[PDB]
Structure 1
Amino acid sequence: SQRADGLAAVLAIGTANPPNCVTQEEIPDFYFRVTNSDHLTALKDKFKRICQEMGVQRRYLHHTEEMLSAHPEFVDRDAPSLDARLDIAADAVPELAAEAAKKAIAEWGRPAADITHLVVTTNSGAHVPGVDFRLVPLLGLRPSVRRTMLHLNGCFAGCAALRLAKDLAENSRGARVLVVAAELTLMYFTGPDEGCFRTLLVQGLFGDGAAAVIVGADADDVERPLFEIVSAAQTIIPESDHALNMRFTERRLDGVLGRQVPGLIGDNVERCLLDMFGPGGWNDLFWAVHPGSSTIMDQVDAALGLEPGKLAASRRVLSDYGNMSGATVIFALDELRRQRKWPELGVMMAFGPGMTVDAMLLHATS
C-alpha cells in the first residue's frame, strides 16, 4: 500500500439537532408536567434554582409530550423500559447523525462516496449492525468503507473518536474519515425522586445533538483544512472512577454524577495537559473544551488562568444546546471557527468517566 505524508487535519464540521426546542426558563414546568409531579412543589423548586445556575439557555429534544404519553414506562422510575428506549434510538440516531454528516460533507466539498473510513460514537444505542452500518445507505457511503462502532464511551467520546481518525487518515494516502458523535437524552429520561439530585442535574444540563467531522491529511486544493491534529493523547485522573459512572440498566441509561467532579478536573487539568503534551502561558493557546457545566468551565478557567474569551465558544455551545455528551466538544470547535472569522496552537479536550481526559493539540491554518 501507501501512506499519507502530513498531519491529519479537520476539513469540515457539521452539526444538527432535534426540531423540538425547550428554553431553560420553560424546562421546569415541562419536566414536572410530563412526569406527573406538579404536586411536588418543593422538589420542583429545588429544580428551578438548579437550572438557573447550569449555564444553559435552551436544549433540543427528540422526545416530546406526545412521545412520553405514548410511553408511561419511561416515567415509572422503577419499571423496565430500555427496549422502548432503544427502539426509538435505533431509528432516531441514524437520522440525526446523517443530517449532521451531510452538513459536514457539504462544507467539505466531495461526495459521501469519497469517504474511506467511518468512526461513529454514541451512548444512545446498542445494536449490531449499529449506526455506523445504517449510515451507509442513509449517506451513500461505499460498501467497503472501513467502520468502527463505539457504543457508550461517555462524555469524552468525541475526542476519543477524533483520536482514531488521526491515525486512520495519516496511515493511508488519500484516506478521508467521517467522524460522527450523536446523543439522545431520552436514554436517561425518567421521573424525579425526592432524593436523587442526579436526575435533576441531567434533566437541566443535557441536550440532544449530533456532530460531524471530516478528517484527512494532504488536503487537496479544493479542500479547506481548518485544523491540524498535531498530537492526540489521553490520560487518567488518579482514584476518581467513583465520581463518574455510566451503565445500561433495565430501567434506562443510569450512572453517577459526583459532586467532586468539577473539583477533580479543576485540581488535575493542568497536570493532565503537561503529561500529555509537556514538550508562554495557557492563554497563548486557543480552546475547545467539553463544557461539563459553567462550574466545570469555571474550574478550567481558574486552574489555567484563562482570559474569559478563551472558553467563550465552549460556554456558548453549552448555553445554546446544553450538554450533548461526546458531540458537545465538536460543536465547540465549530463555534470556535465561526467566531474566529488569533493563536495558532490550541487544545481540544473532554473529560468523562475514569476520570478520563482525552485531548488533542491542534494547529489552526488559513
Structure 2
Amino acid sequence: LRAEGPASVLAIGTANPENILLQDEFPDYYFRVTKSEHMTQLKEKFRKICDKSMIRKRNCFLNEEHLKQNPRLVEHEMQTLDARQDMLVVEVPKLGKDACAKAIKEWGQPKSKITHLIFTSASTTDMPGADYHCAKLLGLSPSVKRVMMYQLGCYGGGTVLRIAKDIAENNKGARVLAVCCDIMACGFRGPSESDLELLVGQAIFGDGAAAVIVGAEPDESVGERPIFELVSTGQTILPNSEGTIGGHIREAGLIFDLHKDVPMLISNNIEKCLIEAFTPIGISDWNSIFWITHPGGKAILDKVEEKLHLKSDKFVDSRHVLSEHGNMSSSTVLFVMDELRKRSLEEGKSTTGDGFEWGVLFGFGPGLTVERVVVRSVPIKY
C-alpha cells in the first residue's frame, strides 16, 4: 500500500542547551578558558571574526566546569575523543529527544503512529546509535524503522527531508520523525598561531537540535495539517570543490577543514541548482519564491544574495537564526523553516512561505555537497 500525493512537513520542534555564549563576550571567554590570553594579535583577529560573523549568541552544552574538570579539552591538539564521546553519546540523543517531543506535541498524534525515525549527527558515533537511544527516550515502538546517518555535516538537514519524502510517499500511513542534533563539544579546542581555520569554526558553530514529522495524506480529521510540501529533491557535488569542507573523527576529537573558497564556490554554482530544480515548474525569477537556506556563514548568504541580486527579504530568516543560534550544522536549516512559518503567521502573510507559493531549501556541507528541496507553502487560515 503506497501513499497518494506528496510528503509534507506536519510539525517542527527545536531545542538548544540552556547555557548561552554571547558573541560580544566570546573572545574574552575563549582566550581565558584556553589560557591563551597572551596571544593578543590572535585574539584581535579572533575578535574581528566573531564581530563580523553576524552571530549575536549561541547555545552550548559545554561549560567552563567541563573545562576545569578536564583541562585537556582546552588544549589545541590532545587525545580527548574518549572524554568527548563519553559526554556526547548521552547528550546528543537527549537533546534530539527534546526537539522530537516538541514536534510531536504540535503534530498531536500518538507516538505509536511514528513508523520511522531518522537521526543525523556529526558530533558523535556509536553502536547502537543515537536513533536507538532517542527512540527509547521517546517511548516509541520497538519496531520503529530507524535510519541512522552519522557524520553527514551541515547539508544533513536537507538529507533527512530527502530520505523522509520517499519513505512517506511509498508507505501509506507512514509518519517519519526526522531529527538533526549537534553539540560542538566534539570539536572545541584551544587556539594555535597556525590556524585561523580553527578560529572560524570556534566562532560560528553552536549547539541545537531540530525535528520534523513528515508524512503524506495528512489527516485533518484528527488534527494533522501540513506546513510545507516536499516537491522534489536533489543532491550534487560542486565542481572544483574537493577538500574545501571536511571533518574527521580523530584522537583529538572532531578536526575540520574549511577553505576560504567555500562562499564563492556556492555562489558561482547555486543558480544551476535553481535552473535544474525549477525549469520543470517554469520558474526563473529567484525573487518570486521563498528561501530556506542553511546559513553556513554570513559570507555564503551575502555572496549568493549578491550573485543572484536577491531582495533582502529572502535570507531574513536565515540571518535571524544565525544571529540567535550560530551555525548548528544539519539542524540549522530546519530552524530556518520553523522561523519562516512563525514569522509568516505573525506578520499576517497569506502562506507559510512568507506569502509565496513555491520555495527552495538548501543545505551545504562536505563534498562540497549541496542538498536541494523544492517546497510548496500552505495557505494560512485567518
* Same fold per superposition (TM over 0.5): yes
Distance in 1, Cα, partners of 2:289 & 2:152: 27
2:115 matched residue in structure 1 = 116
Provide Cα deviations, 1:197-219, integer angstroms capped at 9, x if missing partner. Answer: 12211111010000000000000
Alpha-carbon shift at residue 79 of structure 1 (Å)? 1.5
Distance, in Å, in 1 between the alignment partners of 2:262 and 2:30 is 25
List, as ranges, runs of 4+ consecutive aligned residues in structure 1 with deviation greater than 6 Å. Answer: none
- The residue that corresponds to 1:9 in the other structure is 8
* 1:273 CA displacement: 2.5
State the alpha-carbon separation in 2 of the partners of residues 150 and 277 from structure 1: 28
* Aligned twin of 1:363: 376
CA–CA distance in 2 between the matches of 1:351 and 1:303? 17
Matches within 5 A, 1:179-328: 179-221=178-220, 222-279=223-280, 280-328=284-332
Native 8 Å contact 1:97 1:210 kept in 2: yes
| 1:236-274: CA deviation from partner (whole Å, max 9, x where unpaired) | 111212211111111010121100000100111101232
- Partner of residue 352, structure 2: none
- SS of residue in 2 equivalent to 1:6: coil
**AA aligned opposite 2:102:** K
Which residue identity does 1:235 align to in structure 2?
T
Identity of aligned residues (%): 47
CA distance in 2, matches of 1:195, 1:154: 24
Q: Which residue of 1 aligns with 2:341?
A: 337
Measure, in 1, the Cα distance between the counterparts of 2:63 and 2:18.
10
Deviation at 1:277, TM superposition (A): 4.0
Cα displacement (A) at 1:131: 0.6
Question: Matches of 1:4 and 1:305 in 2, distance apart?
Answer: 39
Q: Which amino acid aligns with 2:263?
A: P
Give the conservation status (yes or no) of the 8 Å contact 2:117–2:135.
no
- Give, in whole Å, the separation in 2 of the partners of 1:277 and 1:138: 40
Please tell me whether the aligned partners of residues 56 and 205 of structure 1 are also in contact (alpha carbons under 8 angstroms). yes
CA contact (8 A) 1:183 1:324 kept: yes
In 1, Cα distance between equivalents of 2:333 and 2:262: 18
Q: CA deviation at 1:292?
A: 1.1
Q: TM-score, normalised by structure 2?
A: 0.94
Q: What is the alpha-carbon distance in structure 1 between the residues aligned to residue 52 and residue 77 of structure 2? A: 29
Is 1:235–1:276's contact at 8 Å kept on the other side of the alignment? no
SS of the residue corresponding to residue 154 of structure 1 reads: coil
* 5+ long unaligned stretches in structure 2: 346-354
Q: Is the 8 A contact 1:14 1:100 kept in 2?
A: yes
| AA aligned opposite 1:308 | S
| CA-atom RMSD in angstroms | 0.9
User: What's the secondary structure of 1:149's corresponding residue?
Assistant: strand
Distance 2:99 2:208 in 1: 9
Query: Is residue 58–residue 325 contact of structure 2 (8 Å, CA) maintained in 1?
Result: yes
Q: Within 2, Cα distance between the matches of 1:319 and 1:127?
A: 32
Post-superposition CA distance 1:143-171 (Å, at most 9, x none): 11000100000110110111000001000
- Greater mean deviation of Cα atoms: 166-175 or 75-84: 75-84
CA 1:234–1:276 in structure 2 vs 1: closer, same or farther (change >3 Å)?
farther
Q: Give the drift of 1:109.
A: 0.6
Q: Note the alpha carbon deviations across 1:297-330, whole angstroms, 9 max, x for none.
A: 0111112221101110011000110000000000
Per the alignment, residue 72 of structure 1 pairs with 71
Q: Report what 2:103 is aligned to.
A: 104
Question: Retained in 1: the 8 A contact 2:277–2:374?
Answer: no
**In the alignment, which residue of structure 1 is the partner of 2:60?**
61
Shift of 1:275: 2.6
Say if 1:234 and 1:276, in contact at 8 Å, map to a contact too: no
- Which residue does the alignment assign to 1:35? 34
Kindly provide the amino acid, as one letter, of the partner of residue 343 in structure 2: Q
What letter is aligned with 1:227? F
Counterpart position of 2:348: none
* Superposition deviation, residue 22 in structure 1: 1.1
Q: Deviations over 1:90-122 (max 9, x none)?
A: 111111001100000001111222100000000
For the 8 Å contact 2:293–2:363, the answer to whether it is kept is yes
Query: Can you give the 5+ residue segments of structure 1 that lack an aligned partner in the other structure?
Result: none
CA deviation profile, 1:27-56 (whole Å, cap 9, x unmatched): 111111111111111111111111111110
CA distance in 2, matches of 1:165, 1:254: 30
Decide whether the 8 Å contact of 1:108 with 1:214 is kept in 2.
yes
